Structures are given as structure tokens and as C-alpha cells.
């Protein structure tokens, strides 16, 4: 698991479950190539997105569909999605904490 994403709900005080996200890698034409995707588990976590071999240096974007999440809860949200864009350089945990009109994201990088 070189890359894990965890999503939390600041309104309900819970993991944010069934949140869909896509991971993209920046290509040489500066376009975003689909790389991996999935939805968060009951613990708010999404594991197994990639492998050590595949996860090479480059610029990656995690696009978290926060809008669909708030919509399912019947709460009007501000953002279309939450975006985390970063360079991988030679384990990454991306955490996102969601509110309807605000989000925060942090990275925990370990070894």
C-alpha cells in the first residue's frame, strides 16, 4: 500500500463511507490520465489503489467526489469535489476531513 486515502465527515463525526474517488497521473502533454479509483470502506479508508512498482515518481491528482456524498445526505455542498494534487518523490496516506462548505486535507508520509 504505497498510497492510501482516508475520508472523514465533520458533520456526523464518522468515517465518510462509500465516497468515490479517482486518482490520475499527469502525462507528458499535461493531461490527466486515469490511474486508479475506488470508494471508501466502512472505516472511511480506500486501500489497494496501486503497487510499489506502478507508483513511480510523477504528479498525481486524487479527485474525491464530495458532492455526491453530501447530496446523498441531503445537505447542500459548496465544492464540486475535493482535489489533492502532489508530486511523489523517492508510504503516502492522504486524509480529507469534509464539511459542506469546507474541507481540509493532510498528508502523512512515512517509512
Amino acid at each position: 500500500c504505497p498510497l492510501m486515502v482516508k475520508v472523514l465527515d465533520a458533520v456526523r463525526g464518522s468515517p465518510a463511507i462509500n465516497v468515490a474517488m479517482h486518482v490520475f497521473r499527469k502525462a507528458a502533454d499535461d493531461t490527466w490520465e486515469p490511474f486508479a479509483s475506488g470508494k471508501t470502506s466502512e472505516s472511511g479508508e480506500l486501500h489497494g489503489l496501486t503497487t510499489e512498482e506502478e507508483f513511480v515518481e510523477g504528479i498525481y491528482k486524487v479527485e474525491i467526489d464530495t458532492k455526491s456524498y453530501w447530496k446523498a445526505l441531503g445537505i447542500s455542498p459548496f465544492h464540486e469535489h475535493a482535489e489533492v494534487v502532489f508530486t511523489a518523490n523517492d508510504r503516502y496516506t492522504i486524509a480529507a476531513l469534509l464539511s459542506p462548505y469546507s474541507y481540509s486535507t493532510t498528508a502523512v508520509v512515512t517509512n
Copy 2:
């Protein structure tokens, strides 16, 4: 205005209006003494808590009553209050802006300190 507090609502995307807060200052006997209090305006801001002469060096605590704010909106929040504790003016007078961003089960707070 060497001390201003601003409170924002992350659920509604608005200032948090009519939020009560109390400020305390640590006394020589290490007890918290009442220093100032007030509530946020329509802009989410609370101005005029103190003056440059009164706001001497010390350890200050701002207790923001976030629980009453959420309850009045029908929400049972996690925290009793948001608490901000800091040493002020240790290197001479500064202006302090304390900001708090509120959600029912979370809050963030930051300080902007100017000279």
C-alpha cells in the same frame, strides 16, 4: 483593537453570528480571571474586547461557546466549546486575530499576529 475574534460556520458557509465567548487571563496565583466577553456580530467578528493599555503580557484563554451556537441550529455538537490558549505580548505589543472555523464534530483555529 489588539484582540479580535472571528468565527465561521463550515456547514452553512457563513459567518457564525451571535456566538458568545469569554476571555480569561491567568493570574499570579495561576487561576483564570475573567478578562472580557462578548458575542460575534453579523460579520462573525467580535471587536473591542480590550485596549492596548489593558492587554498586558500574560497567558490568555478564549472560550468560544460553540455548543450553544449549534444547539440553536438544531444540532447536538461534539464539543462543549472551542478553547484558544496563548501567551500574548511576550516580545512587546502585537495585534492578535483569532479565527475559528466550526463544524458539528470538528473545529479549526488559527491566529494572525501582526506588529
Copy 3:
């Protein structure tokens, strides 16, 4: 000023000054078209990006160049930029204030929307 962006530095407790950002608007062909750009002032604020007439309904993206900000302070940060994507004016004209609070490995963003 129906769109203002404010950026704060959580490491230094200050506005984040001279932070560049670009705003884009989604076109009919679903591509991001350049809309406005600028950099934050000494107050951490960027005003005057657009006008009420120009800021029509649509999906907007604000890309805040947080990486260059940290690099100039000697810090190699995690993120390439902070991105804020939202639908604007869907229920008529609103005023939007986007705030971002920056740390080297984290950022928070909120919106204040008024009518």
C-alpha cells in the same frame, strides 16, 4: 467584488502574501478556460478578479500556487497547489469569499457565500 480569495499561513501566523492564483471556468465543451488571475496583497487578500456582469453561472476552479509560496520560504511542501472547484450563481448572484489556510503538508479551505 463577487469573488475574493484570502490565503493565510499557519506556520508563521500571518497572511500569505504574494501568492499567485489562476481562476478557470468550465466551457461548453467541458474544458477549463482561463477566467482571471492575480496574487494576494499584504493582507493575504486578492480582490477585483471579476465583476458581477462577467461572473455568470458556471463551474469555476481556483488554483492557488501554494508550492511556489512554500519554496520561496525554503520549504518543500506536499501539494502542487490548492484547488477549489465550485458551481457559482446557480440560484442567482452571490458574493463568494474563498479562504485557504496553508501548512507545508496540509491545507484547509472554506467558502463564505452571501446574498
Copy 4:
């Protein structure tokens, strides 16, 4: 583990390790009684603070010594400590994300 505390460092992108904290329970004279304490592990987590039997309804305060943490890193901090005050009502994870002039805290409450 009815109560766990996790602390993260937003400057270094890491768990905040060896962060001391004390947990207090509000007494009937509105004073704070020491209840439990400890310091965060290498994963930034503090477990085993209390038990199901002891952790009764009441108002609790977690006082996290963030100032000593930043001092050890040679970084001047704003806050004396980070405080989380909440009512327990009939598992609690308190997370804190730290920067020198800012902190955020959230609660993940599950069953």
C-alpha cells in the same frame, strides 16, 4: 479502548510522536480532576487511556501539550496547548492536526 487520541504534524507530514497529554473529568465543583494521561506513540496514537467501566457520562477535557512539541522541533508556536472539551454520552477517537499557529481537531465516534 473507549477513547483514543491521535495527533498529526502538518509541517512535517507525519504522526506527532511523543506528544504528552492529560485527560481530565469535570467534577461537581466545576474543577478539573486528573483522569488519565500519556504520550503519543510512533504512530501518533495514544491508546489505553481508560476502560468501558471507568469512562462514564460526563464532561471531559483532553489537554494536548503542543507547545512542548513545537519547542523540541525549534519552531515558535502560538498556543500553550490544544484543548478538546466534550461530553461523553451513552468509541471515541479524537484527532488533532497541528501547525505552529493553528490546530484542527475532529471526533470520530463509532460503534
